Design a protein around this nucleic acid. Structure first.
Ligand code: CTP
Length: 573
DNA sequence: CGTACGTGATCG
Protein backbone atom coordinates (compact mmCIF):
# COMPACT_ATOMS: atom_id res chain seq x y z
CA UNK A 1 0.00 0.00 0.00
CA UNK A 2 1.08 3.58 -0.63
CA UNK A 3 0.47 6.03 2.22
CA UNK A 4 -1.87 8.98 1.63
CA UNK A 5 -4.39 11.14 3.44
CA UNK A 6 -7.95 10.63 2.40
CA UNK A 7 -9.02 14.20 3.07
CA UNK A 8 -12.50 15.36 4.01
CA UNK A 9 -11.61 18.99 3.38
CA UNK A 10 -8.94 21.01 1.57
CA UNK A 11 -6.02 22.19 3.73
CA UNK A 12 -3.26 24.72 3.11
CA UNK A 13 -0.52 22.10 2.80
CA UNK A 14 -2.36 20.69 -0.22
CA UNK A 15 -1.91 24.03 -1.96
CA UNK A 16 1.88 24.17 -2.24
CA UNK A 17 3.51 25.93 -5.19
CA UNK A 18 4.60 22.68 -6.82
CA UNK A 19 2.60 19.48 -6.98
CA UNK A 20 1.76 16.50 -9.04
CA UNK A 21 -1.97 16.75 -9.73
CA UNK A 22 -4.46 14.17 -10.94
CA UNK A 23 -7.94 15.35 -11.85
CA UNK A 24 -9.42 12.08 -13.00
CA UNK A 25 -11.90 11.84 -15.85
CA UNK A 26 -12.61 8.25 -16.66
CA UNK A 27 -15.10 8.71 -19.49
CA UNK A 28 -13.13 8.52 -22.78
CA UNK A 29 -14.89 11.60 -24.13
CA UNK A 30 -14.17 14.14 -21.42
CA UNK A 31 -16.57 16.82 -22.68
CA UNK A 32 -18.99 17.76 -19.91
CA UNK A 33 -17.83 14.57 -18.15
CA UNK A 34 -17.55 13.78 -14.46
CA UNK A 35 -14.42 14.25 -12.43
CA UNK A 36 -14.35 11.10 -10.23
CA UNK A 37 -11.45 11.98 -7.94
CA UNK A 38 -8.50 14.23 -7.28
CA UNK A 39 -5.01 13.43 -6.04
CA UNK A 40 -2.24 15.80 -5.07
CA UNK A 41 1.37 14.85 -4.24
CA UNK A 42 3.76 17.54 -3.08
CA UNK A 43 6.61 18.14 -0.57
CA UNK A 44 4.11 17.83 2.32
CA UNK A 45 2.66 14.45 1.40
CA UNK A 46 0.06 12.63 -0.64
CA UNK A 47 -3.62 13.57 -0.68
CA UNK A 48 -6.87 12.27 -2.13
CA UNK A 49 -9.77 14.70 -2.43
CA UNK A 50 -13.39 14.08 -3.38
CA UNK A 51 -14.24 16.39 -6.26
CA UNK A 52 -17.63 17.58 -4.95
CA UNK A 53 -15.67 18.92 -2.00
CA UNK A 54 -12.54 20.20 -3.68
CA UNK A 55 -14.18 21.89 -6.64
CA UNK A 56 -16.61 23.77 -4.40
CA UNK A 57 -13.73 25.02 -2.20
CA UNK A 58 -12.68 28.54 -3.15
CA UNK A 59 -9.10 28.05 -1.95
CA UNK A 60 -8.66 24.97 -4.10
CA UNK A 61 -10.27 26.58 -7.12
CA UNK A 62 -8.03 29.63 -6.72
CA UNK A 63 -5.01 27.30 -6.45
CA UNK A 64 -6.03 25.51 -9.66
CA UNK A 65 -6.26 28.80 -11.50
CA UNK A 66 -3.08 30.38 -10.11
CA UNK A 67 -0.40 30.30 -12.82
CA UNK A 68 2.31 30.65 -10.13
CA UNK A 69 1.28 27.35 -8.51
CA UNK A 70 2.97 24.78 -10.72
CA UNK A 71 1.41 21.43 -11.51
CA UNK A 72 2.83 18.30 -13.07
CA UNK A 73 0.16 16.19 -14.77
CA UNK A 74 -0.54 13.48 -17.34
CA UNK A 75 -2.91 14.58 -20.15
CA UNK A 76 -3.61 17.97 -18.67
CA UNK A 77 -5.86 18.81 -21.63
CA UNK A 78 -8.38 16.22 -20.45
CA UNK A 79 -8.50 17.81 -16.99
CA UNK A 80 -8.49 21.36 -18.37
CA UNK A 81 -11.46 20.74 -20.63
CA UNK A 82 -13.44 18.82 -18.02
CA UNK A 83 -12.82 21.80 -15.71
CA UNK A 84 -13.80 24.34 -18.40
CA UNK A 85 -17.24 22.64 -18.57
CA UNK A 86 -17.51 23.30 -14.82
CA UNK A 87 -16.53 26.96 -15.19
CA UNK A 88 -13.12 26.32 -13.60
CA UNK A 89 -9.79 27.51 -15.02
CA UNK A 90 -6.68 25.31 -14.76
CA UNK A 91 -3.39 27.23 -14.92
CA UNK A 92 0.25 26.61 -14.11
CA UNK A 93 0.71 23.21 -15.74
CA UNK A 94 4.48 23.15 -16.13
CA UNK A 95 4.96 19.50 -17.04
CA UNK A 96 2.76 17.05 -18.90
CA UNK A 97 4.09 13.51 -18.70
CA UNK A 98 1.95 12.33 -21.66
CA UNK A 99 3.50 14.96 -23.95
CA UNK A 100 6.98 14.31 -22.55
CA UNK A 101 6.64 10.57 -23.26
CA UNK A 102 5.23 11.28 -26.73
CA UNK A 103 8.18 13.45 -27.69
CA UNK A 104 10.78 10.98 -26.38
CA UNK A 105 9.29 8.10 -28.37
CA UNK A 106 5.93 8.25 -30.01
CA UNK A 107 6.08 4.48 -30.81
CA UNK A 108 5.60 3.46 -27.22
CA UNK A 109 1.93 4.38 -27.67
CA UNK A 110 1.97 5.75 -24.12
CA UNK A 111 -1.59 6.47 -23.18
CA UNK A 112 -1.44 6.03 -19.46
CA UNK A 113 0.86 6.88 -16.57
CA UNK A 114 1.91 3.27 -16.07
CA UNK A 115 3.17 3.05 -19.65
CA UNK A 116 5.25 6.23 -19.25
CA UNK A 117 6.57 5.05 -15.90
CA UNK A 118 7.77 1.77 -17.32
CA UNK A 119 10.05 3.85 -19.63
CA UNK A 120 12.10 4.55 -16.48
CA UNK A 121 11.78 1.20 -14.65
CA UNK A 122 9.01 2.56 -12.41
CA UNK A 123 6.31 -0.06 -11.89
CA UNK A 124 4.61 1.00 -8.64
CA UNK A 125 1.47 2.12 -10.50
CA UNK A 126 -1.23 0.10 -12.30
CA UNK A 127 -2.38 0.60 -15.87
CA UNK A 128 -5.68 2.45 -16.08
CA UNK A 129 -7.21 -0.52 -17.91
CA UNK A 130 -6.42 -2.82 -14.99
CA UNK A 131 -8.27 -0.48 -12.62
CA UNK A 132 -11.25 0.57 -14.72
CA UNK A 133 -11.62 -2.47 -16.98
CA UNK A 134 -12.39 -2.15 -20.70
CA UNK A 135 -15.46 -1.80 -22.88
CA UNK A 136 -18.84 -2.49 -21.30
CA UNK A 137 -17.32 -3.98 -18.14
CA UNK A 138 -15.64 -0.61 -17.65
CA UNK A 139 -16.42 1.06 -14.32
CA UNK A 140 -15.13 3.39 -11.61
CA UNK A 141 -14.10 1.25 -8.64
CA UNK A 142 -14.97 1.82 -4.99
CA UNK A 143 -13.28 4.74 -3.22
CA UNK A 144 -10.37 2.96 -1.52
CA UNK A 145 -9.31 1.40 -4.82
CA UNK A 146 -9.86 4.58 -6.80
CA UNK A 147 -8.01 6.73 -4.28
CA UNK A 148 -4.97 4.48 -4.11
CA UNK A 149 -4.81 4.45 -7.91
CA UNK A 150 -4.97 8.23 -8.32
CA UNK A 151 -2.39 8.70 -5.60
CA UNK A 152 -0.04 6.16 -7.22
CA UNK A 153 -0.43 8.02 -10.50
CA UNK A 154 0.38 11.34 -8.87
CA UNK A 155 3.33 9.81 -7.05
CA UNK A 156 4.65 8.41 -10.35
CA UNK A 157 4.33 11.81 -12.04
CA UNK A 158 6.09 13.44 -9.06
CA UNK A 159 8.99 10.96 -9.37
CA UNK A 160 9.23 10.85 -13.21
CA UNK A 161 9.32 14.56 -14.08
CA UNK A 162 13.08 14.96 -13.50
CA UNK A 163 14.19 11.85 -15.43
CA UNK A 164 11.84 12.70 -18.32
CA UNK A 165 13.06 16.30 -18.47
CA UNK A 166 16.70 15.11 -18.26
CA UNK A 167 16.23 12.87 -21.27
CA UNK A 168 14.37 15.56 -23.21
CA UNK A 169 17.29 17.89 -22.56
CA UNK A 170 19.77 15.26 -23.75
CA UNK A 171 17.73 14.91 -26.98
CA UNK A 172 17.49 18.71 -27.36
CA UNK A 173 13.70 18.40 -27.06
CA UNK A 174 12.99 20.29 -23.83
CA UNK A 175 11.99 23.46 -25.63
CA UNK A 176 9.79 21.41 -27.95
CA UNK A 177 7.91 20.28 -24.83
CA UNK A 178 7.84 23.51 -22.87
CA UNK A 179 7.52 26.13 -25.67
CA UNK A 180 5.52 24.15 -28.26
CA UNK A 181 3.56 21.11 -27.17
CA UNK A 182 2.54 22.27 -23.70
CA UNK A 183 1.28 25.70 -24.85
CA UNK A 184 -0.42 24.02 -27.77
CA UNK A 185 -2.25 21.71 -25.36
CA UNK A 186 -3.99 24.77 -23.84
CA UNK A 187 -4.94 26.08 -27.28
CA UNK A 188 -6.37 22.70 -28.27
CA UNK A 189 -8.35 22.70 -25.02
CA UNK A 190 -9.88 26.07 -25.97
CA UNK A 191 -10.71 24.89 -29.50
CA UNK A 192 -12.35 21.68 -28.29
CA UNK A 193 -14.35 23.47 -25.63
CA UNK A 194 -15.52 26.13 -28.10
CA UNK A 195 -16.74 23.49 -30.51
CA UNK A 196 -18.15 24.06 -33.97
CA UNK A 197 -21.82 24.92 -34.54
CA UNK A 198 -23.74 22.60 -36.82
CA UNK A 199 -26.80 23.38 -38.91
CA UNK A 200 -28.59 20.17 -38.03
CA UNK A 201 -31.71 21.02 -40.03
CA UNK A 202 -29.51 21.33 -43.09
CA UNK A 203 -27.85 17.97 -42.38
CA UNK A 204 -31.21 16.37 -41.81
CA UNK A 205 -32.49 17.72 -45.17
CA UNK A 206 -29.42 16.27 -46.88
CA UNK A 207 -30.02 12.99 -45.09
CA UNK A 208 -33.53 12.82 -46.49
CA UNK A 209 -32.46 13.41 -50.06
CA UNK A 210 -29.60 10.92 -49.76
CA UNK A 211 -31.94 8.25 -48.42
CA UNK A 212 -34.16 8.72 -51.47
CA UNK A 213 -31.29 8.51 -53.96
CA UNK A 214 -29.93 5.52 -52.04
CA UNK A 215 -33.22 3.67 -52.44
CA UNK A 216 -33.25 4.55 -56.13
CA UNK A 217 -29.76 3.27 -56.95
CA UNK A 218 -30.14 0.29 -54.61
CA UNK A 219 -33.15 -0.93 -56.62
CA UNK A 220 -31.38 -0.24 -59.91
CA UNK A 221 -28.57 -2.46 -58.64
CA UNK A 222 -31.03 -5.24 -57.80
CA UNK A 223 -32.67 -4.92 -61.21
CA UNK A 224 -29.26 -5.18 -62.89
CA UNK A 225 -28.15 -8.12 -60.75
CA UNK A 226 -31.51 -9.87 -61.18
CA UNK A 227 -31.79 -10.35 -57.42
CA UNK A 228 -31.40 -8.70 -54.03
CA UNK A 229 -28.24 -8.94 -51.95
CA UNK A 230 -26.32 -6.95 -49.35
CA UNK A 231 -24.26 -4.60 -51.48
CA UNK A 232 -22.15 -3.70 -48.42
CA UNK A 233 -21.15 -7.35 -48.02
CA UNK A 234 -17.87 -8.17 -49.77
CA UNK A 235 -18.87 -11.85 -49.83
CA UNK A 236 -22.20 -11.29 -51.52
CA UNK A 237 -20.88 -8.48 -53.77
CA UNK A 238 -17.92 -10.59 -54.88
CA UNK A 239 -20.33 -13.41 -55.77
CA UNK A 240 -22.57 -11.16 -57.83
CA UNK A 241 -19.72 -9.50 -59.70
CA UNK A 242 -17.28 -12.35 -60.25
CA UNK A 243 -19.45 -15.49 -60.30
CA UNK A 244 -22.99 -14.56 -61.42
CA UNK A 245 -22.04 -11.74 -63.77
CA UNK A 246 -18.65 -13.26 -64.57
CA UNK A 247 -16.66 -10.01 -64.47
CA UNK A 248 -12.85 -10.30 -64.81
CA UNK A 249 -10.56 -10.56 -61.77
CA UNK A 250 -7.81 -7.94 -61.97
CA UNK A 251 -12.11 -10.90 -54.42
CA UNK A 252 -11.02 -7.30 -53.94
CA UNK A 253 -13.84 -4.83 -54.59
CA UNK A 254 -11.86 -1.71 -53.65
CA UNK A 255 -12.85 1.48 -55.48
CA UNK A 256 -9.81 1.30 -57.74
CA UNK A 257 -10.83 -2.20 -58.86
CA UNK A 258 -14.43 -1.16 -59.52
CA UNK A 259 -13.21 1.80 -61.54
CA UNK A 260 -11.28 -0.60 -63.79
CA UNK A 261 -14.31 -2.91 -64.07
CA UNK A 262 -16.83 -0.18 -64.85
CA UNK A 263 -16.47 -0.62 -68.61
CA UNK A 264 -17.62 -4.29 -68.38
CA UNK A 265 -21.04 -3.89 -66.81
CA UNK A 266 -23.55 -1.12 -65.99
CA UNK A 267 -23.88 -2.41 -62.43
CA UNK A 268 -20.39 -1.37 -61.42
CA UNK A 269 -20.93 2.40 -61.63
CA UNK A 270 -24.17 1.97 -59.72
CA UNK A 271 -22.34 0.10 -56.96
CA UNK A 272 -19.71 2.85 -56.71
CA UNK A 273 -22.43 5.53 -56.59
CA UNK A 274 -24.24 3.50 -53.96
CA UNK A 275 -21.19 3.12 -51.73
CA UNK A 276 -20.48 6.83 -52.07
CA UNK A 277 -23.96 7.90 -51.03
CA UNK A 278 -23.83 5.38 -48.19
CA UNK A 279 -20.52 6.82 -47.01
CA UNK A 280 -21.97 10.30 -46.84
CA UNK A 281 -25.10 9.03 -45.07
CA UNK A 282 -23.54 6.70 -42.52
CA UNK A 283 -20.41 8.68 -41.61
CA UNK A 284 -21.04 12.33 -42.45
CA UNK A 285 -24.79 12.77 -41.90
CA UNK A 286 -25.97 10.17 -39.40
CA UNK A 287 -22.59 9.86 -37.68
CA UNK A 288 -22.17 13.59 -37.28
CA UNK A 289 -25.74 14.04 -36.00
CA UNK A 290 -25.09 11.36 -33.34
CA UNK A 291 -22.35 13.45 -31.71
CA UNK A 292 -23.87 16.93 -31.96
CA UNK A 293 -24.86 18.25 -28.53
CA UNK A 294 -28.64 18.65 -28.61
CA UNK A 295 -28.70 21.74 -26.49
CA UNK A 296 -26.12 23.89 -28.23
CA UNK A 297 -25.97 22.13 -31.60
CA UNK A 298 -22.18 22.09 -31.48
CA UNK A 299 -19.74 19.27 -32.04
CA UNK A 300 -16.77 19.15 -29.69
CA UNK A 301 -14.01 17.05 -31.17
CA UNK A 302 -11.06 15.75 -29.20
CA UNK A 303 -7.67 16.40 -30.76
CA UNK A 304 -5.31 13.60 -29.84
CA UNK A 305 -2.04 15.40 -29.45
CA UNK A 306 0.04 12.32 -28.45
CA UNK A 307 -0.87 9.68 -31.01
CA UNK A 308 0.64 10.11 -34.52
CA UNK A 309 4.11 8.90 -35.24
CA UNK A 310 5.01 12.05 -37.23
CA UNK A 311 3.80 14.82 -34.87
CA UNK A 312 0.45 15.51 -36.50
CA UNK A 313 -2.71 15.81 -34.49
CA UNK A 314 -5.62 13.48 -34.91
CA UNK A 315 -9.30 14.23 -34.37
CA UNK A 316 -12.08 12.03 -32.97
CA UNK A 317 -15.77 12.01 -32.11
CA UNK A 318 -16.21 13.49 -34.58
CA UNK A 319 -13.20 13.45 -36.82
CA UNK A 320 -13.23 16.99 -38.24
CA UNK A 321 -10.08 16.34 -40.25
CA UNK A 322 -11.70 14.17 -42.96
CA UNK A 323 -14.84 16.09 -43.91
CA UNK A 324 -15.36 15.69 -47.69
CA UNK A 325 -14.17 18.37 -50.10
CA UNK A 326 -12.92 16.87 -53.37
CA UNK A 327 -16.25 15.98 -54.90
CA UNK A 328 -19.10 18.48 -54.84
CA UNK A 329 -21.66 15.95 -53.55
CA UNK A 330 -19.60 15.38 -50.42
CA UNK A 331 -18.32 18.92 -50.19
CA UNK A 332 -21.86 20.12 -49.52
CA UNK A 333 -21.58 18.49 -46.06
CA UNK A 334 -19.50 21.55 -45.19
CA UNK A 335 -22.53 23.82 -45.58
CA UNK A 336 -23.64 22.39 -42.22
CA UNK A 337 -20.62 23.80 -40.32
CA UNK A 338 -21.55 27.37 -39.45
CA UNK A 339 -20.43 30.20 -37.21
CA UNK A 340 -21.48 30.04 -33.54
CA UNK A 341 -22.75 33.59 -33.31
CA UNK A 342 -24.89 35.89 -35.39
CA UNK A 343 -22.99 38.01 -37.92
CA UNK A 344 -19.86 35.92 -37.58
CA UNK A 345 -18.06 34.19 -40.48
CA UNK A 346 -15.78 31.21 -40.99
CA UNK A 347 -12.21 32.05 -42.04
CA UNK A 348 -9.91 29.33 -43.37
CA UNK A 349 -6.23 29.66 -44.14
CA UNK A 350 -4.10 26.91 -45.70
CA UNK A 351 -0.41 26.54 -46.50
CA UNK A 352 0.25 26.08 -50.19
CA UNK A 353 2.47 23.02 -50.73
CA UNK A 354 4.07 23.16 -47.31
CA UNK A 355 5.50 19.61 -47.59
CA UNK A 356 7.30 20.25 -50.88
CA UNK A 357 8.52 23.60 -49.60
CA UNK A 358 9.93 21.89 -46.50
CA UNK A 359 11.54 19.32 -48.83
CA UNK A 360 13.11 22.10 -50.89
CA UNK A 361 14.50 23.58 -47.68
CA UNK A 362 15.87 20.39 -46.08
CA UNK A 363 17.25 18.99 -49.35
CA UNK A 364 18.64 22.37 -50.52
CA UNK A 365 17.71 21.35 -54.02
CA UNK A 366 18.56 24.30 -56.27
CA UNK A 367 15.88 23.52 -58.87
CA UNK A 368 13.13 22.98 -56.33
CA UNK A 369 14.09 26.06 -54.31
CA UNK A 370 14.14 28.21 -57.48
CA UNK A 371 10.71 26.85 -58.42
CA UNK A 372 9.24 27.99 -55.11
CA UNK A 373 11.11 31.29 -55.23
CA UNK A 374 9.35 31.95 -58.55
CA UNK A 375 6.05 30.69 -57.04
CA UNK A 376 5.68 28.29 -59.93
CA UNK A 377 2.91 25.77 -60.18
CA UNK A 378 4.99 22.91 -58.80
CA UNK A 379 3.17 20.11 -60.60
CA UNK A 380 3.42 21.84 -63.96
CA UNK A 381 7.11 22.54 -63.33
CA UNK A 382 7.77 18.94 -62.36
CA UNK A 383 6.05 17.79 -65.54
CA UNK A 384 8.16 20.18 -67.64
CA UNK A 385 11.30 18.72 -66.07
CA UNK A 386 10.49 14.99 -66.13
CA UNK A 387 8.84 14.94 -69.56
CA UNK A 388 11.27 17.51 -71.00
CA UNK A 389 8.83 20.01 -72.46
CA UNK A 390 7.98 23.70 -72.27
CA UNK A 391 5.17 24.97 -70.09
CA UNK A 392 2.75 25.28 -73.02
CA UNK A 393 3.45 21.66 -73.96
CA UNK A 394 2.42 20.21 -70.59
CA UNK A 395 -0.84 18.40 -71.18
CA UNK A 396 -3.40 17.69 -68.44
CA UNK A 397 -2.43 14.03 -68.30
CA UNK A 398 1.20 15.01 -67.91
CA UNK A 399 0.49 17.36 -65.02
CA UNK A 400 -1.60 14.64 -63.36
CA UNK A 401 1.21 12.11 -63.59
CA UNK A 402 3.78 14.64 -62.35
CA UNK A 403 1.55 15.46 -59.39
CA UNK A 404 1.49 11.77 -58.51
CA UNK A 405 5.28 11.66 -58.66
CA UNK A 406 5.46 14.66 -56.33
CA UNK A 407 3.22 12.80 -53.85
CA UNK A 408 5.33 9.63 -54.10
CA UNK A 409 8.52 11.57 -53.50
CA UNK A 410 7.12 13.03 -50.24
CA UNK A 411 5.69 9.68 -49.11
CA UNK A 412 8.91 7.81 -49.79
CA UNK A 413 9.20 6.85 -53.41
CA UNK A 414 8.44 3.31 -54.56
CA UNK A 415 8.30 2.09 -58.16
CA UNK A 416 5.64 -0.52 -57.26
CA UNK A 417 3.71 2.07 -55.25
CA UNK A 418 3.77 4.79 -57.91
CA UNK A 419 2.93 2.13 -60.53
CA UNK A 420 -0.12 1.15 -58.51
CA UNK A 421 -1.18 4.75 -58.15
CA UNK A 422 -0.89 5.64 -61.84
CA UNK A 423 -2.01 2.23 -63.14
CA UNK A 424 1.25 1.68 -65.05
CA UNK A 425 4.06 -0.91 -65.07
CA UNK A 426 6.80 -0.98 -62.48
CA UNK A 427 9.43 -0.26 -65.16
CA UNK A 428 7.39 2.73 -66.33
CA UNK A 429 7.10 4.12 -62.83
CA UNK A 430 10.84 3.52 -62.31
CA UNK A 431 11.62 5.64 -65.39
CA UNK A 432 9.53 8.52 -64.04
CA UNK A 433 11.39 8.35 -60.71
CA UNK A 434 14.78 8.30 -62.44
CA UNK A 435 13.81 11.35 -64.50
CA UNK A 436 12.60 13.05 -61.34
CA UNK A 437 15.91 12.54 -59.56
CA UNK A 438 17.80 13.70 -62.63
CA UNK A 439 15.84 16.97 -62.43
CA UNK A 440 16.04 17.24 -58.65
CA UNK A 441 19.45 15.84 -57.72
CA UNK A 442 19.44 17.58 -54.32
CA UNK A 443 16.28 15.69 -53.41
CA UNK A 444 17.94 12.43 -54.49
CA UNK A 445 21.01 13.13 -52.34
CA UNK A 446 18.76 14.10 -49.43
CA UNK A 447 16.79 10.84 -49.69
CA UNK A 448 19.99 8.80 -49.84
CA UNK A 449 21.48 10.71 -46.91
CA UNK A 450 18.44 10.60 -44.60
CA UNK A 451 18.24 6.81 -44.93
CA UNK A 452 21.92 6.52 -44.08
CA UNK A 453 21.46 8.84 -41.11
CA UNK A 454 18.46 6.86 -39.84
CA UNK A 455 20.64 3.76 -39.98
CA UNK A 456 23.56 5.45 -38.15
CA UNK A 457 21.62 7.27 -35.42
CA UNK A 458 18.60 4.98 -35.21
CA UNK A 459 16.08 7.72 -35.72
CA UNK A 460 15.17 10.72 -37.85
CA UNK A 461 14.17 14.18 -36.69
CA UNK A 462 12.13 17.18 -37.73
CA UNK A 463 13.06 20.85 -37.88
CA UNK A 464 11.93 21.46 -34.28
CA UNK A 465 13.60 18.20 -33.05
CA UNK A 466 10.72 15.77 -33.01
CA UNK A 467 12.08 12.25 -33.35
CA UNK A 468 10.99 8.93 -34.71
CA UNK A 469 12.96 5.76 -34.05
CA UNK A 470 13.31 3.41 -37.04
CA UNK A 471 14.62 0.05 -35.82
CA UNK A 472 13.37 -1.71 -38.99
CA UNK A 473 15.82 0.23 -41.15
CA UNK A 474 18.31 -2.57 -40.49
CA UNK A 475 15.93 -5.48 -41.11
CA UNK A 476 17.07 -8.20 -43.52
CA UNK A 477 13.49 -8.42 -44.76
CA UNK A 478 13.19 -6.27 -47.91
CA UNK A 479 9.58 -5.22 -47.33
CA UNK A 480 10.06 -4.38 -43.66
CA UNK A 481 13.26 -2.44 -44.37
CA UNK A 482 11.76 -0.60 -47.34
CA UNK A 483 8.80 0.61 -45.26
CA UNK A 484 11.29 1.95 -42.69
CA UNK A 485 13.25 3.71 -45.42
CA UNK A 486 10.05 5.36 -46.62
CA UNK A 487 9.36 6.54 -43.05
CA UNK A 488 12.87 7.99 -42.92
CA UNK A 489 12.15 9.97 -46.06
CA UNK A 490 8.61 11.03 -45.15
CA UNK A 491 8.72 11.69 -41.42
CA UNK A 492 11.02 14.69 -41.50
CA UNK A 493 8.79 16.26 -44.18
CA UNK A 494 5.34 15.48 -42.71
CA UNK A 495 6.64 16.08 -39.20
CA UNK A 496 8.35 19.39 -39.93
CA UNK A 497 5.12 20.60 -41.54
CA UNK A 498 3.38 19.60 -38.31
CA UNK A 499 5.95 21.50 -36.22
CA UNK A 500 5.44 24.63 -38.33
CA UNK A 501 1.64 24.74 -38.12
CA UNK A 502 1.76 24.03 -34.35
CA UNK A 503 4.07 27.00 -33.86
CA UNK A 504 1.82 29.07 -36.13
CA UNK A 505 -1.15 28.27 -33.86
CA UNK A 506 0.75 29.47 -30.79
CA UNK A 507 1.91 32.58 -32.61
CA UNK A 508 -1.60 33.27 -33.96
CA UNK A 509 -3.21 33.05 -30.55
CA UNK A 510 -0.68 35.44 -29.08
CA UNK A 511 -1.42 37.95 -31.86
CA UNK A 512 -5.17 37.57 -31.51
CA UNK A 513 -4.87 38.32 -27.83
CA UNK A 514 -2.59 41.33 -28.31
CA UNK A 515 -5.09 42.74 -30.76
CA UNK A 516 -8.08 41.82 -28.54
CA UNK A 517 -9.83 40.25 -31.50
CA UNK A 518 -12.82 38.06 -30.76
CA UNK A 519 -11.67 35.74 -33.53
CA UNK A 520 -10.71 32.24 -32.41
CA UNK A 521 -9.48 28.94 -33.74
CA UNK A 522 -11.95 26.15 -34.24
CA UNK A 523 -9.99 23.48 -36.13
CA UNK A 524 -6.67 22.44 -37.57
CA UNK A 525 -6.51 20.10 -40.58
CA UNK A 526 -2.76 19.39 -40.87
CA UNK A 527 -1.87 22.31 -43.09
CA UNK A 528 -4.87 24.55 -42.54
CA UNK A 529 -6.40 26.54 -39.72
CA UNK A 530 -10.12 27.25 -39.47
CA UNK A 531 -11.34 30.20 -37.39
CA UNK A 532 -14.61 32.02 -36.77
CA UNK A 533 -14.90 35.73 -36.11
CA UNK A 534 -17.17 38.71 -36.29
CA UNK A 535 -17.67 39.92 -39.86
CA UNK A 536 -16.07 43.24 -38.74
CA UNK A 537 -12.78 41.35 -38.14
CA UNK A 538 -12.37 39.82 -41.60
CA UNK A 539 -10.25 42.62 -43.07
CA UNK A 540 -7.81 42.41 -40.17
CA UNK A 541 -7.68 38.61 -40.35
CA UNK A 542 -6.97 38.71 -44.10
CA UNK A 543 -3.66 40.36 -43.20
CA UNK A 544 -2.90 38.87 -39.80
CA UNK A 545 -3.59 35.17 -40.25
CA UNK A 546 -1.50 34.60 -43.38
CA UNK A 547 1.32 36.75 -42.00
CA UNK A 548 1.55 34.79 -38.77
CA UNK A 549 1.36 31.46 -40.58
CA UNK A 550 3.97 32.51 -43.16
CA UNK A 551 6.40 33.81 -40.56
CA UNK A 552 6.11 30.91 -38.06
CA UNK A 553 9.52 29.64 -39.26
CA UNK A 554 12.04 30.95 -41.73
CA UNK A 555 13.02 28.57 -44.50
CA UNK A 556 15.22 28.83 -47.58
CA UNK A 557 11.98 29.22 -49.59
CA UNK A 558 8.95 31.36 -48.78
CA UNK A 559 5.98 29.94 -47.02
CA UNK A 560 2.76 30.81 -48.79
CA UNK A 561 -0.69 30.89 -47.26
CA UNK A 562 -4.01 31.11 -49.05
CA UNK A 563 -7.20 32.16 -47.31
CA UNK A 564 -10.93 32.52 -47.74
CA UNK A 565 -13.95 33.34 -45.66
CA UNK A 566 -17.70 32.86 -45.83
CA UNK A 567 -20.97 32.17 -44.07
CA UNK A 568 -20.31 28.42 -43.72
CA UNK A 569 -17.23 26.22 -43.95
CA UNK A 570 -18.31 25.30 -47.52
CA UNK A 571 -18.26 28.96 -48.56
CA UNK A 572 -14.86 29.61 -47.06
CA UNK A 573 -13.44 28.65 -50.46
C1' DC B 1 4.44 4.96 -52.36
C1' DG B 2 3.00 8.62 -46.11
C1' DT B 3 -0.32 9.93 -41.73
C1' DA B 4 -4.98 9.41 -39.52
C1' DC B 5 -10.54 7.83 -38.14
C1' DG B 6 -15.54 5.83 -38.80
C1' DT B 7 -18.36 2.60 -40.64
C1' DG B 8 -20.56 -1.93 -41.65
C1' DA B 9 -19.42 -6.73 -42.11
C1' DT B 10 -17.36 -10.41 -40.26
C1' DC B 11 -15.90 -13.42 -36.88
C1' DG B 12 -14.02 -15.24 -32.70
N1 CTP C 1 17.38 22.20 -25.80
C1 CTP C 1 16.64 22.29 -27.02
C2 CTP C 1 17.23 22.80 -28.22
C3 CTP C 1 16.50 22.86 -29.40
N2 CTP C 1 15.18 22.42 -29.41
C4 CTP C 1 14.34 22.46 -30.59
O1 CTP C 1 15.08 22.52 -31.78
C5 CTP C 1 14.78 23.75 -32.42
C6 CTP C 1 16.01 24.28 -33.11
O2 CTP C 1 17.03 24.34 -32.16
P1 CTP C 1 18.25 25.32 -32.30
O3 CTP C 1 19.16 25.17 -31.12
O4 CTP C 1 17.81 26.75 -32.15
O5 CTP C 1 18.98 25.09 -33.67
P2 CTP C 1 20.22 24.14 -33.81
O6 CTP C 1 21.51 24.91 -33.64
O7 CTP C 1 20.36 23.64 -35.21
O8 CTP C 1 20.12 22.94 -32.81
P3 CTP C 1 21.24 22.63 -31.76
O9 CTP C 1 20.77 22.73 -30.34
O10 CTP C 1 21.84 21.26 -31.89
O11 CTP C 1 22.43 23.54 -31.82
C7 CTP C 1 14.24 24.62 -31.35
O12 CTP C 1 13.47 25.66 -31.84
C8 CTP C 1 13.46 23.67 -30.54
O13 CTP C 1 12.20 23.38 -31.05
C9 CTP C 1 14.62 21.93 -28.24
O14 CTP C 1 13.36 21.51 -28.29
N3 CTP C 1 15.34 21.86 -27.03
Amino acid sequence: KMAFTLADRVTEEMLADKAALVVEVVEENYHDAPIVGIAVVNEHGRFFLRPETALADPQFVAWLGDETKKKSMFDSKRAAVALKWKGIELCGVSFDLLLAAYLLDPAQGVDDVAAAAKMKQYEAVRPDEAVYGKGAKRAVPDEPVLAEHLVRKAAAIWELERPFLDELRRNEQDRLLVELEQPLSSILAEMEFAGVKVDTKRLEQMGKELAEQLGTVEQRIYELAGQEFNINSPKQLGVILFEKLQLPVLYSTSADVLEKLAPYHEIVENILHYRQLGKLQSTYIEGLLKVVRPDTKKVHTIFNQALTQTGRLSSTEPNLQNIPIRLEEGRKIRQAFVPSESDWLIFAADYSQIELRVLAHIAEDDNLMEAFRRDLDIHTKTAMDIFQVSEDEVTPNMRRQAKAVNFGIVYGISDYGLAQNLNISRKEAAEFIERYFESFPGVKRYMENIVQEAKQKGYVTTLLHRRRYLPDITSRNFNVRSFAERMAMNTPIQGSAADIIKKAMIDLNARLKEERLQAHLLLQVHDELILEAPKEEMERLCRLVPEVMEQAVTLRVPLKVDYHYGSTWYDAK
